[PDB]
Amino acid sequence: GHMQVARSTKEIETSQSTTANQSDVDDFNTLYDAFYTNSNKTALKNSQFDKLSQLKTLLDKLEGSREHTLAKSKYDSLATQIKAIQDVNAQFEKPAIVDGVLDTNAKAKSDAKFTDIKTGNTELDKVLDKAISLG
């Protein structure tokens, strides 16, 4: 076209393989940060789990970019932490890791089949566990 835009006035990026965008990354990281009840990311909010496919979507926004890696390693991480939560919550009649904290009020179903899930998030592992300890 006659506009001619490039990396010239779009920050100091490009020419270093593919790279993500903040409309890709920031929201990713944000919704991602959001899955975590705290920024230590040692605990997970369950309302965010519905956005895990969205976090995958934002990671999908990272898709094709280098950030994707990092962010897949964030995403997949976060996804696992929640999936873990899900896994074990999924064993209860009602989730028992909710907001990084287990629901002792939960009900480890007759279908509850727990796994010593390591998400890499220890405190989460320990809350994952928490639930399993209801099981």
Swiss-Prot record:
<comment type="similarity">
    <text>Belongs to the MapZ family.</text>
</comment>
<protein>
    <recommendedName>
        <fullName>Mid-cell-anchored protein Z</fullName>
    </recommendedName>
</protein>
<comment type="subunit">
    <text>Interacts with FtsZ.</text>
</comment>
<comment type="function">
    <text>Early cell division protein that marks the future cell division site and supports proper FtsZ ring positioning.</text>
</comment>
